[PDB]
Paper text:
CPV are protected by a robust case (polyhedron), each a tiny crystal of viral [name], whose volume varies from 10−3 to 103 μm3 depending on the CPV type. In the alkali conditions of the insect mid-gut (pH 10.5 or greater), the crystal dissolves to release the infectious virus. The polyhedrins of CPV1 and [name] possesses a conserved structural core with modules of variable structure associated with it. Unexpectedly [name] crystals contain only a single ATP molecule, positioned in a broadly similar position to an ATP found in CPV1.
In parallel to the XFEL data collection, crystals were analysed at 100 K on a microfocus synchrotron beamline (I24, Diamond Light Source). Data from 768 crystals yielded a moderate resolution data set with a CC1/2 of 0.3 at 2.15 Å resolution. In the absence of a good molecular replacement model, these synchrotron-source data were not, in our hands, sufficient to support structure determination. Using this room temperature structure the synchrotron 100 K structure was solved trivially and refined to 2.2 Å. To accurately determine changes in unit cell dimensions between room temperature and 100 K, powder patterns were collected at Diamond Light Source, which showed a contraction of the unit cell dimension on cooling from 106.1 to 104.9 Å (values used as the cell dimensions for the XFEL and synchrotron analyses, respectively). Despite this temperature-dependent variation in the crystal lattice, the correlation in intensities between the XFEL and synchrotron data was excellent (90.9% overall). The structures are very similar (r.m.s.d. in Cα 0.26 Å after rigid body superposition). To see whether this occurs in the [name] polyhedra, we artificially increased the unit cell for the 100 K data to match that of the XFEL data (thereby isotropically ‘swelling’ the structure of the monomer) and performed simple restrained refinement of the resulting structure. Remarkably, these structures were then almost indistinguishable (r.m.s.d. in Cα 0.17 Å). Nevertheless, the strain in the (unphysiological) 100-K lattice is enough to sever the partially formed disulphide bond.
Residue numbers in the entry:
A (entry chain A), B (entry chain A), C (entry chain A): 2 to 237
Write the structure that this text describes.
């Protein structure tokens, strides 16, 4: 069927190549998994720089008998990890802290410069002893580069992931995903800068709650086209 | 009264011309109207680029017997529109979805480049079949230009509106309103760039809830000076 | 002990000087104090420009019998201050409005250009009669300069504060803290601009609630290294 197949091939190529267009978004899905198997996904998109910033209050599992906990209640629990004996808790809040964090990156990403910073519970640079004096961005460990794990993007050649296991303490997150400009053109240079600046931080973020991973796969990953890897190394 | 009238005229001109000053804000009021007549207004301001980003959870009517619904409850309802059978609802959530969206723009706006993007329920570019691959900003349809409707600004010569009717599904919003630089000066060029960047994203957003449109007119529009048009084509 | 003291001195200098590094954050703590002595702290950090924006709903004391009030309830109270008879209240909401606002700035700050704008209840420039026409940023009064009060930073030579007393009406806040580039190098110039832009707005904000000031000192100030001054002029 020469021309119906040609037409199919062109439609495939148009979908596969679309992310490399000027103003086509790079895509970031962050998934937090909790001990009982619930998943919280946070989606961020931008063509130029994704800035995926998540407070530690926003990373806790926050549902309680069908009701959403307040930032105040969640921050009260987190404080006990930040500042010794700063709350009244006599048992940990490990049940609501992520077991694991998954970062799914898709599109025309500069993989040399994508930065994923797991920061401490109140947003300071992670360290044994956090302090306003030693608080910075883009620490060397944040640049994952070839530590990102290739995943199928079904023809895009443009999806990778990074996984991290937490050890029972709350964290915040700062991810910076910059656009691949390795074609030699600096989109920030010359008159185009005003247009690039106008496009930063323009796309709504979306937070979703799932009672388990299959729900996450069925109603997020496979609905929109982000391949994810489960604990058995099976892709969905 | 030559000089008391001269003084009046100068005071009029100073108020009327103020938006054209460097660091004077352009103003964006987005109003969502719901079936029972409630209005939710979202106000954004900036001198250089207004970025008016609204999640679909933030656009639902979220009050319930005097109590505000959680993002979680609202997002649970919206999911059924995004992902087939992703929630347990047996009836629609049309009662809490906007009937209509109104966008009021006032100030020294570049009307050739102002962009209003009605995006899908989870923030992806609107299309019959939304997907991470075909997710972008500043789609051609977003530039309204002469589809904006002139409204009185009482001497500013600087207010226009755009209206859109929804059809029962939830949406998110991304608006970019850039400053008119048609006097030939690029505020992003040379040393002034650092100062322009310092001014982006500095003004608090304000969300207001009204049980009906007259409340919206009385306690928002006429209080601060944004002319609005009702369903009978009367200005307030 | 020549070399153990040399080692101590070098460790002191490394902590004291760290904020002057490229990508080292400037730090902003805003503290609101309320009539019964509760404190709400808001922490913002960035290397290049801190943009510390706080809605008037976010500045009210919002805890009520251990539960967090909704933005809707808080905004309903604030509206009565913005727009005469726009709510049903027969008594003021002074109990939940700050008595006083404290701004703590630490790091490599340009003290000539740091701007602190106490804006009106709905985000407009503060004035007797607020209006969309006379809404701007960086008003002359916002530049505090030598009105900032030096505080000990324990070797950094880099902490200052500004204090303001409110008079029973709600306000919003916009603070811009730009990086000291008085070494003669414009970090926005040339190829480094893309990297500076990638770093803006990347660090999680953190809101904390304290029942009294000693809690604020014990579990925030002294935990992380921000010196604060109490009503008796004692530093903590
Ligand atoms: N179960 C799995 N676990 C881990 N990695 C996998 C798994 N399956 C595939 N991958 C990895 O994904 C990458 C792409 O594989 P493949 O070529 O099959 O995908 P594709 O559909 O062609 O999409 P793309 O256009 O991204 O290549 C490979 O590096 C592959 O090893
Ligand atoms: N009821 C209405 N419905 C739709 N458009 C209207 C209505 N009334 C006025 N307008 C439009 O608003 C625009 C400005 O009108 P007008 O000159 O009366 O306002 P103004 O007070 O002078 O303010 P400005 O300085 O913005 O002109 C005109 O294009 C006018 O047609
Ligand atoms: N109780 C106080 N009230 C107001 N200001 C104070 C108080 N104590 C100290 N300061 C001010 O703080 C500034 C720095 O003082 P000092 O040199 O003692 O601090 P330091 O530990 O050396 O830290 P730095 O490196 O910031 O100087 C001085 O201007 C000082 O007057
Ligand atoms: Mg392949
Ligand atoms: Mg006119
Ligand atoms: Mg000193």
């Amino acid at each position: 069927a020469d021309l119906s197949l040609a037409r199919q091939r062109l439609t495939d190529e148009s979908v596969n190549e679309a992310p490399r267009a000027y103003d086509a978004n790079m895509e970031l899905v962050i998934v937090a998994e909790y001990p009982e198997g619930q998943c919280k996904s946070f989606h961020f998109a931008n063509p130029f720089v994704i800035k995926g910033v998540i407070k530690s209050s926003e990373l806790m599992w926050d549902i309680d008998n069908g009701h959403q906990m307040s930032e105040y209640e969640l921050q009260r629990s987190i404080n006990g990890y930040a500042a010794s004996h700063s709350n009244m808790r006599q048992r940990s809040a490990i049940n609501r802290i992520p077991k694991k964090l998954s970062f799914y990156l898709r599109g025309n990403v500069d993989w040399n410069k994508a930065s994923i910073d797991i920061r401490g519970p109140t947003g300071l640079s992670m360290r044994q002893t956090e302090e306003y004096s030693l608080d910075r961005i883009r620490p060397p460990c944040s640049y994952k580069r070839n530590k990102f794990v290739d995943l199928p993007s079904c023809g895009g050649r443009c999806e990778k992931a990074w996984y991290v296991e937490l050890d029972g303490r709350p964290v915040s997150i700062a991810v910076i995903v910059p656009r691949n400009m390795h074609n030699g053109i600096n989109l920030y240079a010359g008159p185009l800068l005003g247009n690039v600046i106008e496009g930063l931080d323009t796309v709504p973020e979306c937070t979703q709650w799932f009672d388990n991973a299959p729900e996450l796969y069925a109603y997020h990953a496979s609905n929109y086209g982000m391949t994810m890897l489960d604990q058995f190394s099976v892709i969905h």
